[PDB]
């Protein structure tokens, strides 16, 4: 239903144990030295 100005899709490859870290409010090597999701978010992490 909704409408917005743009949708930003970012893509990475992280090993399974670290998929938890790419979320809001997580700390570790991946979310602190490599990619940091903002504290507030409206988005859907998807991993296969």
């Amino acid at each position, epitope marked *: 239903d909704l409408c917005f100005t743009n949708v930003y899709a970012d893509s990475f490859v992280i090993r399974g*144990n670290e998929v938890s870290q790419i979320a809001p409010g997580q700390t570790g090597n991946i979310a*602190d*030295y490599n990619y940091k999701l903002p504290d507030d978010f409206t988005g859907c992490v998807i991993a296969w």
Partner: antibody
Amino acid sequence: EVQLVESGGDLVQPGGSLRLSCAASGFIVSRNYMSWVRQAPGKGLEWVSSIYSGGSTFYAGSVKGRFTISRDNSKNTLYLQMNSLRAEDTAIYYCARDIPRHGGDSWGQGTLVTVSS
Amino acid sequence: IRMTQSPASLSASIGDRVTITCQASQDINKYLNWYQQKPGKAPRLLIYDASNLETGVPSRFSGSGSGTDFTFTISSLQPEDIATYYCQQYDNLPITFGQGTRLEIKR
């Protein structure tokens, strides 16, 4: 030489607050991974806390909210503020620098904490 | 991880071939370090990653493993080798050590 005189602590009543201090020879504390192991007398070493190169703090289950870790840029001296102690925390505490994957280590001689009544 | 070391009293004569086995409860891949703690003196790091012995060590200690079960070997048992060896995994946040295998010498 990476030699550590991590020497602080001797003992307090149950419910006290002790302050450890570590120290540093070739490196700077705030740039390398460091952690604090805990060796009870006659028992396998157990892991209490760990700091990262950007300030991330991780604790153990038994020390959630009683223990604190803190890193001091000015004089090395990785600080570990023991608070809300008890009568089963008696163990030898070793300061430890762990470079994560490339492999070197410092475990300093370590200090004794016997906290009792 | 429920780290498991199977030999705790193992006693070999001068110059023998022994082996220590540290076992885990999940796949830790290759991130398991082998330590050596002499009596009183602070532990030393002997084999980081489970497959790399640190430089400056004598060249007898070798270790190899992957996934759950790991093994530690001693090639020449010099008399000045009495200590307690520990296996540590350093990438799962609840870092759990092993029990130690107190090694002694027989004569």
